[PDB]
Amino acid sequence: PDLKNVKSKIGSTENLKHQPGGGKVQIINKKLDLSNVQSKCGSKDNIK
């Protein structure tokens, strides 16, 4: 006898393209703007 060609069915041989692929993460951080800010009591200029 002869079998010519035969192969397995179905598993890890059909998976070899798809890893799958991974990704990327990031924070999750900010600031605030302070540029407007002055004190809200204010007598010391009255020295004038």
């Binding site: 999750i28 703007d33 800010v37 002055q38 809200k40 010391k44």
Partner: protein, 112 residues
């Protein structure tokens, strides 16, 4: 040594009420004949403002929790502008703890 600000002319408010202190039922308690009730205005609150300045900035930078306030009707600028006010209050309390001495600008030479 029990320390007031340099500028203080008059720092006090005193009162007399004839009815005594009276406690509650239901303790081992002191039925005293007289008492005082005091309120202190002081820059010492500026130590616990500095703690709110510390607590806030570690959470708010990382933006921890803020989404719980967002989702129940609140601006982001609300937190920012409250801490802005704390940035003012810090100084509103610093422009008082100072001594009343006068002067401005810059000099490096003699008058005499």
């Amino acid at each position: 040594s029990i320390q007031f600000v340099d500028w203080c002319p008059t720092g006090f408010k005193v009162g007399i009420n004839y009815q005594p202190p009276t406690v509650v039922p239901g303790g081992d308690l002191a039925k005293v004949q007289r008492a005082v009730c005091m309120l202190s205005n002081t820059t010492a609150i500026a130590e616990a403002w500095a703690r709110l300045d510390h607590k806030f900035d570690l959470m708010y930078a990382k933006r921890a929790f803020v989404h719980w306030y967002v989702g129940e009707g609140m601006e982001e600028g609300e937190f920012s502008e409250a801490r802005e006010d704390m940035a003012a209050l810090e100084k509103d309390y610093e422009e008082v703890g100072v001594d009343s001495v006068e002067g401005e600008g810059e000099e490096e030479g003699e008058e005499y």
